[PDB]
Design a protein around this motif. Structure first.
Motif: not given
Lengths: 171, 171, 171, 171, 171, 171, 171, 171
Positions: D18, F18-19, F49, F71, F74-75, F78
């Motif tokens: 990030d 998408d990340h 994360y 994950l 946090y998402i 995912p």
């Protein structure tokens, strides 16, 4: 004290911080030699806004001073540096019993006889290396590379200058 | 003990975090040596805003502290590091009975005789490899590579310095 | 005295500062010779807005002045420079006892016999290098390279021109 | 259990998810070795905001722990990893009757004698391969590569360490 | 007076200033040969909006005139140039006692016999070079390359044309 | 049956759709092995994360399921895949009478004796190719390559495993 | 007369002007053959919106007209061109006494015997070059290359077709 | 009728028009092989949103049908194509008296014996080429490459299949 001075055909690279429209007019991908400022035969280069800049015979810092002052008319307090993207104007010729003979560019880094041997692939085994001919400014001189490496003697090594010819005869 | 010190002709690479206009004035594609800051013969390099910085004879950490403190006048708490994009100023000469004779740069990493020999493509079969000549500060010694690889002897190995000549004679 | 003059087939590179739509119509990744302006057989190249520009027989500074003045009709005070991305029009032929025989471009940098020989991979061992044939404007001379490297003699060296043939015979 | 530890001259690569302004301060194009963090002779590297990081003698996870904690002062819950972009500090020397002798870097992957042979192009046919000399920490030892491949015996293979010399004598 | 004319299989490159959607429909990275306009066997190429463009037998300026006028229906006062990204349609064959025999493309730059020798790596030492066969339009002719370089005589050199065969027999 | 399992030193490549901040923290230009996640000696790799992930001894599908589930904290939902950018941990040694002897990586694709021989530049003319020595888990066998290519015999071929040594002796 | 027709395995490149989402779905960096549309064994390729397009046995102009008409349902007046990124389907085999024997692609440019020989690195010195065997549609002929280069004879030359075998025997 | 079918270890490339977040999750620069979808040993690949896709034994169009239907749950009317970025699962082995022996991948393009010879650099002059051994599905067969080129006879050529061994014995 060794100082390079720009000659015609050199390609210069001008960096103007905060102004990529000046530093990279043709983008970031092409090399600085393919995007730089050609020095014309009359000794000048064009730089935007300020016009023609006399650069032949001048050092990089002197060109920097010249360009920085004139750009201040068009750019607020310009931060400028100048270096050479292509050393095309000045050269020494190393021929004879070196592995890879040919031209070697005169640049901002001093080129001694010993420095010139290596870029030429080194001597061949049939080199008359105790008997090398250096032609500098219409004078001739004999140089012994054997003593430079066997006795470490730097009193035979020389700094090479534009137009110099270094010939290593066969034995 | 070993520390490199910047010399004229070196190209430095200055990274200023959060300031790509300073880190990459010519974009991000060209190499750091093709965009870095040249060290002039008077021992200074130009840096934007702060002007000329004396870097010759100084270490990278010292140049970093110098640039960081002066850049703080123009940037709040600047985060700066400096390294070398091109080691052009200092060099040792390896010649004689090595497969790749020639010029080897003095850098921030120590360069010993054993490093230089290995970097020179190795010795040849006709190398007088128990009798190698090291010229350092105008004083020759005799070095035996044979004992270094056959007898574990480091007391013949040497660290090489700028201007040093290492000559491996035939046999 | 020496100045290159554009010929048909040359590819020119025109930089218009602050106008990447003009400098790089095909983007910034492709080389300048792969995107530059071809010189047509009638001696003109097309340039946007101003149309056809006659460039053959003219120098780079003259083409720059021509393009700049006519571009001012469409752009306020245009900042323009012109150089050559590809030297395709003029050329000298080096053949015979050189390690790399063949075709050598005539460019903005002077090309002398000594330049061409060094650029041709050097002479061969069987070169009649005291008796080299230079054909220039339909008139042959005899040239001695031996004296140029053994005796410092420039009075046998020559600057090469378009169409010149340099033949190094065997012995 | 094999653990590499950073030494001076290594180039480290710090990834801060990030935060591309930290991960790639000089852009995405240059390699991680040309943009990474140089380890200075005193064992430290500079990292932005946190200052000097002592990394010599430490593992990658230990450096990760150190940097992650201190970056939390400036970045919310930083997600950081650390690896080496250039293994420049530690090396073993493989010389003698191997095809391609020279230095081999000590890295995070274990380098055994057998591993070192291959990177050196393999043995030559005149290798006294039943009689290889390994110099480790001022001790000498004899190694037989013949039994390693003919009998599959791993009791002659050894793990190589920084500074080790592996010499394969001619027969 | 030498004029190239487009043939089938050529790949053309059309530059439309201020319209990168036309100049670079597939982006800036791929070469102009990999993104250009293929000339179909019937002599036409497709160009967007204007449809099929008859280009075989036409010069670059003539194609430029054709495309520019028709694009004016869709683009305000279009600024267009046309060159060839790949010369695939026309070719001469150089075989025999040249170092690197094979096909040589006919392009916008004139290809003479002498020009063709060099791109073929030059003559071999067993070339019957006073006796070279040129086949042009169903006629045969004998050519002497020896006199071209020994006597500088251009009255034996010839311009090469599409389909010509240049054969250098062994001696 | 065959499945690769991650080892220490492997570099993993994790794609999170998408990340791009996760997939490409260092940008999209550098290779996946130059930006991927190193596997540490304790068998874990760091991932943002979720922290340290144990990957040694696990398959790619198992690591994917592990990373995806953690994950998800946090998402939202995912979409993750994992593969290997660098196979650095496991390897077989091919030596002796092959044209390219040396080290061959154990990967997700099976590596048989026939694969390794073909990948080693082929056998030599002096290979005892009916009597090849395979060392696997401290136990040697005799392997006949001759029958595999002359008699269609797969019952001498073998799948190679980490640490295996394949020795092709002379004759 | 000559026209290439698409076969299974070909990779097509479709350019839709003003639609980079169609022209470059995978970006602009990868080559057109690494991103193009594969032709399936049933003779169709998939194209977005319009679905499967039958391309085998059709010319590029015919495929273009087909795609353009069907794409008009989804795009107003689509500007489309089609060419071939990879010629993988059709091929001729050149073997025997040529310096580079092997496989040569059949493309939109005609490939004659003289083209294939020149593309194969040239004949060898031991080629029976007055007696070359051409196999076309299951029927062999005798071809004399000698007369083609010595006597200007095109009446022995042939255009090569898919599946053709050209065998140059020794002498 | 020749149809390739995906095997484990293949790397597939999925194109989803209008969705570069799916087509290029790791950006546009890396090759499709370095960013594609690995086929796991159990025959499945992961694709985002739809989960695991059984692809081993299936053709490209069949995988296309499978992926397109399931993506419709998450993407409106998805336009999807599928090809292979790396053929890693299936291979034939060509050894013996061919110039460059080794493995050749089985792909979507048919690989015949003749096709396989060329990718192997062609036969050597000591090839027993009238007597080539083909091992297919545990059967052996004798093949004559001489008649394939001298008599144009295709009744000796064969299509190569996964696992086939083609051995050209010395004479």
């Amino acid at each position: 004290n060794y100082q390079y001075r720009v000659g015609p055909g050199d390609v210069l690279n001008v960096t103007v911080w905060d102004h990529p429209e000046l530093t990279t007019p043709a983008g970031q991908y092409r090399s600085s030699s393919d995007t730089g400022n050609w020095v014309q035969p009359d000794g000048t280069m064009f730089y935007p806004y300020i016009g023609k800049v006399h650069v032949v015979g001048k050092t990089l810092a002197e060109i920097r001073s010249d360009i920085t002052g004139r750009l201040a008319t068009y750019i607020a307090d310009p931060q400028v540096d100048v270096n050479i993207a292509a050393f095309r104007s000045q050269k020494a010729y190393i021929s004879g019993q070196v592995n890879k003979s040919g031209q070697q560019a005169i640049t901002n880094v001093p080129l001694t006889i010993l420095d010139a041997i290596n870029a030429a692939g080194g001597l061949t085994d049939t080199a008359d290396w105790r008997n090398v001919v250096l032609t500098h400014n219409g004078r001739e001189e004999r140089i012994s590379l054997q003593a430079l490496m066997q006795n470490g003697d730097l009193n035979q090594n020389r700094l090479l200058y534009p137009g110099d010819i270094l010939y290593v005869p066969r034995n």
